[PDB]
Structures are given as C-alpha cells and as structure tokens.
Scaffold this active site. Structure first.
Site, PDB file in Angstrom:
ATOM      1  N   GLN A  61       0.843  -1.195   0.000  1.00 15.14           N
ATOM      2  CA  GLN A  61       0.000   0.000   0.000  1.00 15.14           C
ATOM      3  C   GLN A  61       0.875   1.240   0.000  1.00 15.14           C
ATOM      4  OE1 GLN A  61      -3.293  -2.121   2.941  1.00 15.14           O
ATOM      5  NE2 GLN A  61      -2.942   0.080   3.069  1.00 15.14           N
ATOM      6  N   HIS A 142       7.260  13.801 -21.384  1.00 15.59           N
ATOM      7  CA  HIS A 142       8.257  14.681 -22.006  1.00 15.59           C
ATOM      8  C   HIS A 142       9.644  14.069 -21.876  1.00 15.59           C
ATOM      9  CE1 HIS A 142      10.245  18.766 -22.795  1.00 15.59           C
ATOM     10  NE2 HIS A 142      11.197  18.225 -22.050  1.00 15.59           N
ATOM     11  N   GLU A 143      10.030  13.838 -20.622  1.00 15.67           N
ATOM     12  CA  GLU A 143      11.430  13.435 -20.417  1.00 15.67           C
ATOM     13  C   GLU A 143      11.688  12.039 -20.971  1.00 15.67           C
ATOM     14  OE1 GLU A 143      14.009  15.113 -19.467  1.00 15.67           O
ATOM     15  OE2 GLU A 143      12.815  16.960 -19.519  1.00 15.67           O
ATOM     16  N   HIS A 146      12.661  12.021 -24.472  1.00 16.81           N
ATOM     17  CA  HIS A 146      14.033  12.275 -24.937  1.00 16.81           C
ATOM     18  C   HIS A 146      14.779  10.955 -25.151  1.00 16.81           C
ATOM     19  CE1 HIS A 146      14.100  16.667 -24.206  1.00 16.81           C
ATOM     20  NE2 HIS A 146      13.867  16.502 -22.918  1.00 16.81           N
ATOM     21  N   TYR A 157      21.669  18.222 -28.405  1.00 14.61           N
ATOM     22  CA  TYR A 157      20.979  19.127 -27.482  1.00 14.61           C
ATOM     23  C   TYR A 157      21.565  20.527 -27.487  1.00 14.61           C
ATOM     24  CZ  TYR A 157      17.808  20.068 -23.670  1.00 14.61           C
ATOM     25  OH  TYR A 157      16.760  20.546 -22.908  1.00 14.61           O
ATOM     26  N   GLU A 166      13.602  19.412 -27.726  1.00 13.42           N
ATOM     27  CA  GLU A 166      12.682  19.872 -26.690  1.00 13.42           C
ATOM     28  C   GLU A 166      11.243  19.885 -27.171  1.00 13.42           C
ATOM     29  OE1 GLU A 166      12.374  21.058 -23.494  1.00 13.42           O
ATOM     30  OE2 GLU A 166      14.122  19.774 -23.176  1.00 13.42           O
ATOM     31  N   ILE A 197      -0.218  29.182  -7.279  1.00 12.26           N
ATOM     32  CA  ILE A 197      -0.874  29.937  -8.344  1.00 12.26           C
ATOM     33  C   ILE A 197      -1.617  29.079  -9.353  1.00 12.26           C
ATOM     34  CG2 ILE A 197      -0.528  31.824  -9.957  1.00 12.26           C
ATOM     35  CD1 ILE A 197       2.458  31.900  -8.779  1.00 12.26           C
ATOM     36  N   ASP A 226      21.124  28.652 -22.143  1.00 11.99           N
ATOM     37  CA  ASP A 226      20.172  27.552 -22.286  1.00 11.99           C
ATOM     38  C   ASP A 226      20.508  26.727 -23.524  1.00 11.99           C
ATOM     39  OD1 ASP A 226      17.858  25.944 -21.868  1.00 11.99           O
ATOM     40  OD2 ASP A 226      16.683  27.265 -23.152  1.00 11.99           O
ATOM     41  N   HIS A 231      15.098  25.514 -24.654  1.00 14.67           N
ATOM     42  CA  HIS A 231      13.814  25.538 -23.977  1.00 14.67           C
ATOM     43  C   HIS A 231      13.033  26.815 -24.317  1.00 14.67           C
ATOM     44  CE1 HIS A 231      16.015  22.837 -21.065  1.00 14.67           C
ATOM     45  NE2 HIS A 231      14.849  22.202 -21.111  1.00 14.67           N
TER      46      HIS A 231
HETATM   47 CA   LIG Z   1       0.540  26.670 -10.476  1.00 18.35          CA
HETATM   48 CA   LIG Z   2       3.221   0.740   2.536  1.00 18.65          CA
HETATM   49 CU   LIG Z   3      13.487  18.413 -21.584  1.00 17.80          CU
END
Ligand SMILES: [Ca+2]
Ligand SMILES: [Ca+2]
Ligand SMILES: [Cu+2]
Ligand SMILES: [Ca+2]
Ligand SMILES: [Ca+2]
Length: 316
Positions: A61, A142-143, A146, A157, A166, A197, A226, A231
């Site tokens: 669990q 996303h990742e 790659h 990259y 990207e 937010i 970058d 990105h």
């Molecule tokens: Ca947020």
């Molecule tokens: Ca557990």
């Molecule tokens: Cu990425």
C-alpha cells in the site's frame, strides 16, 4: 529482482488513488513486469547518487506522502509505455522493450526532472516553484520522450536541433496527457508548477508568447545561454505543432487543423525516419512534409496544413 507479479494501490502527488504493478519477494517492490523488460522505480533518498535503491514497501500500500512521487513516476512511466505501444507500435524507448527506470526524491528542493541518458530523475520541488515533478504526466512523458529521440533521430541538445529535441518532447508529452485523458491541455507542467498559483505552467504550446517564448522564427533567441535557447526556441516548433493539430490564424497565416492523431503520426514518422542529430528548423519542415506525404499523399490536406503551420511560424 526475482519474485511474483502483483498489484499494489497508492496515492500520487495530487492525492489521486491508483493501482500500480509491483513485485513481491519479501518486500513489495515498484517493479512492473507487465510492460516490456519491466518498469523499475527507485528512491534516491534526497541524495544525488543514482539510481538509488529499488523501491521496497512492506504491505503493497503506497499512501504515505513520501510514497506519492514514486507512485506517479511508476504509474506514468507505464501510461507512457502504453501510449507508445498502442499508438505507434513502439515497444519502450529503444523499440526493443528496454527496461524503464526512474528515481524519485532526487536531491533536496530540486526544481526539475530529467532523463539522463539511462533513466528518469525527479526532484521533489521546493514546495513553492514545484511540488514533486512526477506528479505531472506531461512532464513524465516529455522526459521519457528524450529517450526515444536518443534512439532514433539523435537530435543534438544545442541550438536549433536542441529546440527541436525539446519541442518533440513537449509534443509527445502533451499527446500522452491527452491519451490519458486527464484534464488535458497544451501547456507544460501545470499539474506540478507553483502550487500557490492557479492556471499557469512552464510554457504553453498554443501560445508560447504567454510565457515569453518565441512564436515566430524572427523572434528566435540567438544567444548562447540555455544551450542556445533549447527551452526557448522550442516555442516556435511547439506553436507549429499546435497549429497543425488545432489549426488557427497566426500572424495573418491561416492553418486548417488536422487533429492530434495525425499530428502524432506525422511527427512520430518524422522523428524516426527523417530527422538527424543536426537537423535544423528548415530540415524539420522538410521532414514533417515528407512524413505527411508518405502518409496522406503529396496533395492532401495534411501536407497543406503542415506547410501552412511552418509558414505561420516563419520557418521556410
Ligand atoms: Ca501553479
Ligand atoms: Ca506501505
Ligand atoms: Cu526536456
Ligand atoms: Ca493538464
Ligand atoms: Ca499539460
């Protein structure tokens, strides 16, 4: 580990309950033997040593707060596998059922997540800028995408090939979020970005400008930070991808959308059959067009939309 397959239950980062495939041998491990050569999730224990130790639990669990990032990293790695298998007939990221390994609780307050060439790595966030990043299915997909790029096009990259890299990850991350059909959208990272937010994200594909990223080649970032704006300039390709699927008018250029499935098929084909490590934006255009041509014929609506989308973002 060697053991027998079973099913555990837990809650992920956002408090949602889900079943997870585990393996029992004294302890219950986060090891899913139902997908390929397996999906394996590890605890980095707030350190930066990887992968750390295969996640072990006494009762199958997973409801502790400490468990939540692991639950999602594991589950979403499985949803991503399923996406690629069911939609593109691709088996894991190498196309040969490679084992997928993920580590969570990487470092302390680490505001990021990444594929490192061998596995997935997830920070917990600092609790302000981010909550544990495996909470975001688009982030996970996303990742992991790659890895697919590493084994197919090999996009370097850096500079334009790096922004394509990207963009490709943003494109399949989003398509995986839509496939999972859980509050899908064309923004990246909204489920785990800034818990204080509402309604923001790392970036937007439908209007990159919303977060300061370029939506036209003329607005491309040209500096060296970058990695040459990988990105940042992805906004340009992301915008194009968005218009191909959903259509629209952009800088007075109009695009008839052809929907997410075709977008996926066209970009999956471009990625695995035509892009190269040093492909630039212009080359991506030629690759997506040729892919659409292969799939729908040189005078199809699909090819025309691709041509219009790249025109709209200024990529000739
Ligand atoms: Ca947020
Ligand atoms: Ca557990
Ligand atoms: Cu990425
Ligand atoms: Ca969403
Ligand atoms: Ca999203």
């Amino acid at each position: 580990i060697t053991g027998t397959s079973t099913v555990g239950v837990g809650r992920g980062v956002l408090g949602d309950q889900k079943n997870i495939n585990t393996t029992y041998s004294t302890y219950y491990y986060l090891q899913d033997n139902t997908r390929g050569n397996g999906i394996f999730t590890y605890d980095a224990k707030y350190r930066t040593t990887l992968p750390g130790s295969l996640w072990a639990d006494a009762d199958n669990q997973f409801f502790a707060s400490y468990d939540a990032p692991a639950v999602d990293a594991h589950y979403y790695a499985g949803v991503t596998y399923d996406y690629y298998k069911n939609v593109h007939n691709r088996l894991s990221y190498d196309g040969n059922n490679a084992a997928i390994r993920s580590s969570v609780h990487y470092s302390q307050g680490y505001n990021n997540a990444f594929w490192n060439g061998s596995q997935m790595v997830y920070g917990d966030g600092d609790g302000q800028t981010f909550i544990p990043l495996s909470g975001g299915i688009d982030v996970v997909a996303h990742e992991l995408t790659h890895a697919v790029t590493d084994y197919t096009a090999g996009l370097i990259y850096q500079n334009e090939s790096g922004a394509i890299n990207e963009a490709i990850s943003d494109i399949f991350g989003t398509l995986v979020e839509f496939y999972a059909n859980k509050n899908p959208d064309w923004e990246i990272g909204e489920d785990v970005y800034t818990p204080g937010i509402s309604g923001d994200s790392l970036r937007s594909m439908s209007d990159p400008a919303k977060y300061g990223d370029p939506d036209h080649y003329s607005k491309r970032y040209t500096g060296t930070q970058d990695n040459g704006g990988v990105h940042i300039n992805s906004g340009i390709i992301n915008k194009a991808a968005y218009l191909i699927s959903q259509g629209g008018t952009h800088y007075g250029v109009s695009v008839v959308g052809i929907g997410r499935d075709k977008l996926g098929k066209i970009f999956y084909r471009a990625l695995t059959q035509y892009l190269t490590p040093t492909s630039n934006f212009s080359q991506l255009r030629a690759a997506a067009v040729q892919s659409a041509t292969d799939l729908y014929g040189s005078t199809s609506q699909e090819v025309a939309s691709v041509k219009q989308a790249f025109d709209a973002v200024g990529v000739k």
